[PDB]
Amino acid sequence: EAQTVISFHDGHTMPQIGLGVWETPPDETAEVVKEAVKLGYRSVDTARLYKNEEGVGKGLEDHPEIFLTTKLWNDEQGYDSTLRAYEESARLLRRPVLDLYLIHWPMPAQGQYVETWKALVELKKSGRVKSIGVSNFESEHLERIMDATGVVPVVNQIELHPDFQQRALREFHEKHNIRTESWRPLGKGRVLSDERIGKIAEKHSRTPAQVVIRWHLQNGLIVIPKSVNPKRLAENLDVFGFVLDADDMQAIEQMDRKDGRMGADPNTAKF
Ligand SMILES: NC(=O)C1=CN([C@@H]2O[C@H](COP(=O)(O)OP(=O)(O)OC[C@H]3O[C@@H](n4cnc5c(N)ncnc54)[C@H](OP(=O)(O)O)[C@@H]3O)[C@@H](O)[C@H]2O)C=CC1
Fold this sequence. Notes:
Residues 17-256 form the NADP-dependent oxidoreductase domain. This protein is an alpha/beta fold and 271 residues long. The chain has helices at residues 26-39, 53-59, 79-92, 113-125, 139-149, 167-176, 195-204, 208-218, 230-237, 246-253; strands at 5-7, 13-15, 19-20, 43-45, 67-72, 98-103, 129-135, 155-159, 179-183, 222-223. The chain is built from 10 helices and 10 strands. Helix 2 links the parallel strand 4 and strand 5. Helix 1 (26-39) runs parallel beside helix 2, helix 3 (79-92) crosses helix 4 and helix 7 packs across helix 8. It starts with a strand and ends in an 18-residue tail after the last helix.
């Protein structure tokens, strides 16, 4: 039962499930990354925010095949600053050419995300990075960057889980051939004890976590679940052995809530 992959509009391809690295210190980070790779993760996602790209870099040492994504933090937005930030990240990650680079937040009040996107466009044009995308962008922000550059992000990585399904934004992505990547895919773990999910889990002899990740997969979404537990890491990846049926998919669709968002709202975020 092979893992699936999602391909971008730019012709590049990304494993559909990856490891969300969080605020693990460098040293523990290397060992988590090494363990996850041993387990069969083919993709790792980190961010400058986390200050652990050195750890990820060391954990991926003999693993050039692993799809590597990182993100430019808010305080490095700007054309020249983003160029410098990308080159620093590539050094710390010990991968001269990264697979995906993302703007972490639009931060509209900063007024810098458009010039940041131009830097990413230049990084892609010059061959310094394979693919470029964004994170936490609303449709308006996507419109702005596409209008200014004519270059469409391959991915927008957004908070997405059964309580907050981002349906309207996904309709916009669809229209522009932008892939959706889900962060917080388990909604902090809250959904894992939901009865509706539990019933679907019993139905397939899988865990609630496995049901939820499979739901993201069946929606064509790239998913980066986070775990520090080797057992849960293994479990989260074991999701190519079953299929959620139409009834299941409808049942999860019904969980969407107007007040489901758990993280910052892009339009109002201040750090
Ligand atoms: N682009 C952005 O702005 C942001 C991106 N992110 C990304 O998304 C993630 C968000 O964090 P979080 O809400 O914790 O993410 P998730 O929705 O992936 O939930 C992870 C939590 O659930 C637990 N868990 C994972 N697998 C299982 C399982 N099989 N069974 C039971 N429990 C499980 C974990 O505990 P344990 O680790 O002990 O297994 C952890 O506490 C981070 O990895 C980060 O990379 C986060 C914030 C912002």
